[PDB]
Every structure is written in C-alpha cells, then in structure tokens.
Amino acid sequence: AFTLADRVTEEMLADKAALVVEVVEENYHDAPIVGIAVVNEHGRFFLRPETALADPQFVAWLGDETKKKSMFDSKRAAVALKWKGIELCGVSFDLLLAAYLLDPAQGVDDVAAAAKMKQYEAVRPDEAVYGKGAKRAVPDEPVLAEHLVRKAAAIWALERPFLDELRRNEQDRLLVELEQPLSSILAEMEFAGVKVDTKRLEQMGEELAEQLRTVEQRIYELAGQEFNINSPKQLGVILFEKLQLPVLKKTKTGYSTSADVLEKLAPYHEIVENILHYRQLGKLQSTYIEGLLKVVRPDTKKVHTIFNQALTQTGRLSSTEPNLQNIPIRLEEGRKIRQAFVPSESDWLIFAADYSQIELRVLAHIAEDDNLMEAFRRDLDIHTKTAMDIFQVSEDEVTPNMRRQAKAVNFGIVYGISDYGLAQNLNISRKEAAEFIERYFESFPGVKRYMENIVQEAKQKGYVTTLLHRRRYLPDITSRNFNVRSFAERMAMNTPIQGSAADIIKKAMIDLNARLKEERLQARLLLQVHDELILEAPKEEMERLCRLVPEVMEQAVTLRVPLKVDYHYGSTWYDAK
DNA sequence: CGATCACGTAC
DNA sequence: CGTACGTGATCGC
C-alpha cells in the first residue's frame, strides 16, 4: 500500500528515493507529467503533479544534487521538467541505463522488462496499463497511482542487484561516469533544439515539387501509361512485364526495384534513369522536406530530437522525431537540406568536428597491427595505403578504381568481412572478393589475428567487450546454422570496433561539456552523429573552439595511434564543411 | 488502424 | 557485409 498524498510533506523529501515522474507521451518534449511517485525509507507516496510541481520544497528537492534519486529513463523526466522550468538533479542511478549496459539485447524499454531480469514481477508493463496506439490512454487515478508506485518500488528494490551485477561485469564506472553523465548532456542538447530555416525548407519543397512533376510526366510517356511510381509492385509490372526489362534480382513476392538493381537496367531503357531521379527527388521531398516541417515547433522553429541512449546493440546513440543522424550529405542535391539548419541566435555560427577514420584507428589499436598502426602514425590516406598493399603497387600507381575497391574492403573489414557481402558491394564474384580479403589479411596479419581471436573469445566467454567495458552477448556464435552463426561472428568482429568508437565519442562529449563550462563559453552541443559533434556558438568563440574542440575530442582516450579530428564552421550546417 | 515489407538515408 | 529511422504501399482486420 501507499499514500495518495494531497500535500507534499517533509518525509517525502528524504535524501535517497526512487522517483517516478511519469511522462506517457512518447515524444516527451513539452509533454504533460501525469503523475509522480516517491518511494524512500519513510514510505510510498503518490503525488498529483499540479500539486507537487508547484510546491517550492518539492521543487527544491528535485533540484538538490545532494538528494539522491533512483529512476528509470531519467532523461525523459529531466527534459519534461526542463520545459516546465524545473531542474532535476541528484539522479544517482538510472535503471534503464543499468539494464542497457548489462544486456542491450533484452530490448528493455520499461521498468517491468528490467525487473524481470531479477525475478521481480510485481509491476505491470507500461503497455498493459496505457494500452497501445489508438487505444493508448492514461487510466484513472487509482489505476495510475498504483502503477507509478509499483514502478518506484521496483526501482527501489532493483538498484542493489543491478549495481551488483554491473560491478561483477566491471561496468559500474561505465554507468556512473559515462552513461549517466551523458544522459544529462543529451537532455540539454535535446532541450536546446536546432533552429530550422523553414522558409528555405518550404522553397526547396516548391522547386522539388516542380521537378517531381516534370520527371513524373516523362516517366508516364516512356512507360506509355500512368501508374503509381512509388509502388514497388506496379513499377515492377511496368519494368519487368510491360517493358520486358531483365530480372536480375527477385524479392520474396515479386521483383527487386532497388536503386542498385536499377543502376544495371539503365542501359536498356530511358525510363530507368528517370525512375532513379524520381526516387531521389521523392526521398528528399517526403522524408527531409515534408518530414522535417512536420516536427518543427511552429513557435520557435526548432526541432527537438530525442536521443535514444539505451537502444543500439553497439553503444551508439540513435535519434528520433526527427532523426538528425541521417540528413543527406553524399549527393549535393540532398546536402543542400543542411542549409536549413541554422544557428538559433543571430551572429552565432555552426561548428562541426568529426573524427577522421575513428573505427579503423580503433581497429589498429585493438589489433596491434604493425602495418595499420604505422599507416595512421604516418597519417596516410588509409584507403590509398590499403590499395597499395592489396594490389602491390606504389602510391603513384593507385588508380581511382583501385582506391574505391580498397575503400570498400576497409568498410567490410570494419563491418565483419565475408566473401559474399563484399562481392555484393563491389559487384564482383565471391572468389574474386575472397582474393581481396586474403590479400588484405596478408597485408594486415594483426587484423587477421584479431578477427580470429575475437571470434574465439566470443565463443569462449559468450560475449565481446569494448574499450570501456560495454558488452554484447552473442549466443548465435554457437548455432549450427551457417547464416546465423556467420552474422554472430561478424558482430563479434564489428562490435568492439563500432562500440569502442561510440565509447570514445561519448567520453569526448562529457569532456567537452566540462571544458566549455570551465572556459565560460556560450557554445553549446546540439547534435552527435556517431563520429561527429555539432555545436553552435557566438562568432566570437570560433577561434577558441577551433583549438578547444579538436583537442578535447582527440585526447578523450589514448590509443596506440593518434586520434585525428577535422573541423569546420559556417552560417549553416551545410556551410560547416 | 496496426503491421509487414521495400526502399533509402546516415555513419 | 555493421548500426539505425522514416516513409509509402499494401494487406487484412
């Protein structure tokens, strides 16, 4: 049982508590707080938010760093409280992050899933209480209050066994000194938001909508008929039945119309290039023009992404609503989308700094490959150097195509090399791709040793680890199905690389946030895109940031090879190039 | 109205 | 061949 409290009392403000500040809306930016639960040595309390969040003593308790709180997904509460002008401090245990570190593959997304890991089931899943999708609703106060108190009581009960296992895993510091501080930095980034030049976005959509109608009309002529070009089904009928184009790849229901397939068909018919062009144009229009405009706040013209810190199997962040980690950059036409991301104050600028080849640098370090490490110590172009080695030529004799093929091998090596997936990438045979890989491993025998050893370790221990002791369990490493076992071996190879690079940029972010405060700079972190950080800052801070940000990022850890950071700034994200 | 499947964008 | 997220179509409810 529990107290359904009319008033905040002093015994609710003990210096250690499990705290529930319930935000049911999936997107928590400026969202309602539907209820509060406090469990401490003195009892269990449910508070209505309109009462508690107006009580100065409760608010002061929330903001007191010395009053320690155990929570689940504290960034959600912190951000929702930021939008009410209320500061949340003292969060010393985040059960979501603790569960994520212990085993990211559980998909732990609510208190009940984490509690099940320790045989605790006296709490319902959020989806049972709130329902799903259309039927999603906040239940009446008695049902609501019991749920929130059960969650807090679960958090209260679960802190000790989770911290105990984290210690056994040598992951206690990972939680307390990396993920939990990073959660506060992400809350600040999300709350700040990124300012969007919506008028520029709208005028892009207007010229895109002109060009879409042009290509669209040309497509119907060359097809001799109108059809929904966006349907892979109808399009496959125009292409592979009406126009008789060769079927180079079947899907499961019909024929593949992926861009890769369409590349090969363009010589046979003028329609294919137009469908390609229609597809690129339509991708920008629907996902990056219309998509972005839908999530801009009309008052501030900012987008406030949500960084999912407890989701990827490797330790990377993900970004939602909008995803700001996949804004186009490769093709110029899509890169112009970044012109719409602008500083949020006048006479400020966008500063962007990115690690140069952090994954291959991490690989050099963990493999202790003499050749690969020397290449980075010489700051060589790694793709050209790999081509020189694989194809046994001097630098002068590396052709553009050789470099392109060596680059693809370098990507495969990072992702988990296999004869078949490189062959696919390079449009070559499997025996040919196997010869490339064999020649890579002859040139980098330390990388070969590392790939063999880490697979054997994943089989022996049941998991692989990263630099800062993140882990990923790989039960499929022992499967007797070749496809399933191979994916697990590739994950054994890739996760220490991708995950270690994630560890490093997360530590950089923490170190950078500390340095910016020490230096009293107004510069603020806005975004992280896996190996780059995006800031905005007064124009008068650029020269100091040119020195400060790359140094903090490069010194975040010490590897057997240097870390190298490139950096640029400009009046928009596009210009920060 | 979910939910699957293709597809495409980033790193 | 790694890791994500969003959009559109399409099916069956």
Count the Cβ atoms, other than its own, within 10 Å of residue A429: 11
CA–C1' distance A498–C2 (Å)?
8
Handedness of CA A421, A425, A427, A432 (dihedral sign): negative
A478 and A366 together in one domain: yes
Could you tell me if A394 and A378 are in contact, meaning their C-beta atoms sit under 8 angstroms apart?
Answer: no
| Cβ-based neighbours of A289, under 8 Å, separated by 6 or more | A201, A202, A204, A205, A208, A337
The nucleotide lying nearest A495 (C-alpha to C1') is: C2
**Within 10 Å of residue A405's Cβ, how many Cβ atoms?**
22
Tell me how crowded residue A101 is: count the other CB atoms within 10 A of its CB.
24
With beta carbons less than 8 A apart as the criterion, state whether A91 and A71 touch.
yes
Give the residue whose CA sits closest to B11 at C1': A530
Is residue A134 located within the same domain as residue A175?
yes
The first and second tokens of residue A65, run together, are: 């760093």
Residue listed under structure tokens 């030529």: A393
- A135/A90 same-domain check: yes
Residue at which a domain ends, from A458, A473, A501: A501
Which nucleotide is at minimal CA–C1' distance from A530?
B11
Boundaries of domain holding A309: 196-320
Residue with tokens 């060596």: A406
- Has residue A527 been placed in a domain? no
Q: What CATH code is carried by the domain that includes residue A153?
A: 3.30.420.10
- A566: three-class secondary structure by DSSP: strand
A188 and A214 within one domain: no
Token readout for A125 is: 């899943």
As for how many domains chain A has, the answer is 3
| A259 and A188 within one domain | no
- Specify which residues A68 forms β-bridges with: A16
Which ranges of A4-123 does DSSP label H, i.e. alpha helix? 49-52, 56-63, 74-83, 95-102, 111-116
CB A382 within 8 A of CB A410: yes
Are A18 and A76 in the same domain?
A: yes
Q: What CATH number is attached to the domain comprising A315? A: 1.20.1060.10
Is A540 inside a domain boundary?
no
Positions of strand B less than 7 angstroms from a protein CB: 1-3, 5-11
> CB under 8 Å, gap of 24 or more: what pairs does A188-192 form?
A188/A524, A188/A525, A189/A307, A189/A524, A189/A525, A189/A526, A189/A527, A189/A528, A190/A29, A190/A75, A190/A79, A190/A304, A190/A305, A190/A306, A190/A307, A191/A29, A191/A79, A191/A82, A191/A83, A191/A304, A192/A344, A192/A524, A192/A526
Tell whether A203 and A170 lie within a shared domain: no
Distance CA A50, CA A31 (A): 14
- Let me know whether A184 and A225 are in one domain: no
Say whether both A82 and A218 belong to one domain: no
CA distance A390 to A409: 10
Query: What distance in Å separates the CA atoms of residue A4 and residue A14, rounded to the nearest whole number?
Result: 17
DSSP secondary structure code for residue A119 in this structure: T
Cα(A37)–Cα(A32) distance, integer angstroms:
15
For residue A55, say whether it is annotated as part of any ligand binding site: yes
Q: Which two tokens mark A16? A: 């250690």
Cβ neighbours, 10 Å, residue A389? 18
* Nearest nt by C1' to A228 Cα: C9
Q: In whole angstroms, give the CA distance from residue A21 to residue A247.
A: 56
CA distance A273 to A5: 67
Give the number of other CB atoms < 10 A from CB of residue A392.
Answer: 11
Q: Which residue matches tokens 């903090």? A: A552
Q: Are A550 and A356 in contact (CB under 8 A)?
A: no
Nucleotides of C under 7 A from a protein CB: 1-11
The verdict on residue A158 lying in a domain is: yes
| Distance, CA of A561 to CA of A543 (rounded, Å) | 27
Beta bridge partners of A446: none
Are A467 and A496 contained in the same domain? Answer: yes
Strand A341-342 relative to strand A463-465, pairing: unpaired
**Amino acid A233 CA to nucleotide C10 C1' distance, rounded Å:** 9
Encoded tokens for A561: 């090879």
Which residue's alpha carbon is at the shortest distance from the C1' of C6?
A287
Determine if residue A354 is labeled as part of a ligand binding site.
Answer: yes
Report if residue A413 sits inside a domain.
yes
* Measured CA angle at A84 (ends A80, A90), to 5 deg: 65
| Residue A93 exposure: Cα atoms within 13 Å on the Cβ side | 23
SS (H, E, C) A96-116: HHHHHHHCHHHCCCCHHHHHH
**Smallest Cα–Cα separation from A91: which of A190, A181, A27?**
A181
Residue A486 approaches strand C within 7 Å at CB: no
**A359 in a labelled binding site:** yes
Residue ranges of the alpha helices (H) in A119-197? 126-130, 141-168, 172-173, 180-192
User: Is residue A340 one of the residues assigned to a domain?
Assistant: no
Q: Strand, helix or coil at A549?
A: helix
Q: Are residues A152 and A214 in the same domain?
A: no
Structural contact between residues A47 and A59, judged by C-beta atoms closer than 8 angstroms: no
Estimate in Å the CA A136 to C1' C12 gap, whole number. 22
What's the rounded Cα separation, in Å, for the pair A98 and A114? 9
CB burial string A472-499: b at 16+ within 10 A, e below: bbbebbeeeeeeebbbbbbbbbbbbbbb
A283 CA, C9 C1': Å apart: 15
User: CATH no. for residue A481?
Assistant: 1.10.150.20
The last residue of a domain, from among A164, A194, A224 = A194
Tell me the β-bridge partners of A37. A20, A46
A279 in any annotated domain:
yes
Instruction: Pick the last residue of a domain from A159, A177, A194.
Output: A194
Q: Is the dihedral of CA A117, A120, A121, A122 positive or negative?
A: negative
Query: Cα separation of A418 and A412, whole Å?
Result: 8
Q: CB atoms < 10 A from the CB of A428, how many? A: 15
**Is A487 annotated as contributing to ligand binding?**
no
Distance A55 CA to C6 C1' (A): 41
Residue A528 counted as domain residue = no
- Residue A493 lies inside a defined structural domain of this protein: yes
Tell whether A158 and A54 lie within a shared domain: yes
